[PDB]
Design a binder for these strands. Structure first.
Length: 154
RNA sequence: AGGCAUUGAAAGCGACCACCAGGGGCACAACAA
């Protein structure tokens, strides 16, 4: 949103926190889960995402994983992505998470209202059988009232 | 009015067609205490 925060304390324990205005859990977890994979990929830092005000304190081999996610909504467990990740796994995780977000927002979403309350069903069909990726594409087409995909979407 | 004589060979189907389009999710609810 050349330093501008020079009066603020140096962050030895750097915590960042989310707020959302629909009241459900999957809606609460979609931005933290994305941020908790993302910030280690941008900055090489180690993340714990939790509801807990007390953290796990990190040290020289507590550091043996890059990310922990304490108790994510069940869309996470349904994707089968680990709740704890070593640094090599973070780009596989960001790929699966954005691939399911960019597939949920195509069908079972509306342009001003993302309807993340339905994300567990979009994950469960994609994981059951991979051709359901095209079943979701086709749902998108019908919402969009379009009979055929663009050449790019194919 | 009589005897006689109530039938006979062959054929018993042949061609073509055994479907056509279009739809194959639609809505919402993902926690409550």
């Amino acid at each position: 949103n050349q330093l501008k925060y020079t009066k603020e304390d140096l962050p030895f324990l750097a915590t960042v926190y989310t707020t959302t205005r629909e009241k459900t859990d999957t809606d609460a977890w979609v931005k933290p889960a994305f941020l908790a994979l993302l910030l280690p990929y941008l900055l090489g830092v180690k993340a714990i995402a939790t509801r807990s005000m007390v953290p796990l304190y990190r040290s020289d081999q507590d550091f043996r994983e890059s990310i922990h996610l304490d108790g994510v909504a069940g869309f996470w467990s349904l994707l089968g992505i680990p709740t704890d990740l070593r640094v090599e796994d973070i780009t596989p995780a960001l790929n699966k998470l954005l691939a399911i977000y960019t597939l949920h927002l195509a069908a079972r979403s509306s342009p001003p209202k993302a309807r993340w309350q339905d994300l567990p069903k979009t994950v469960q069909e994609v994981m059951t059988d991979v051709l359901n990726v095209f079943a979701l594409a086709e749902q998108g087409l019908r919402r969009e009232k379009r009979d055929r995909p663009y050449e790019s979407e194919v």
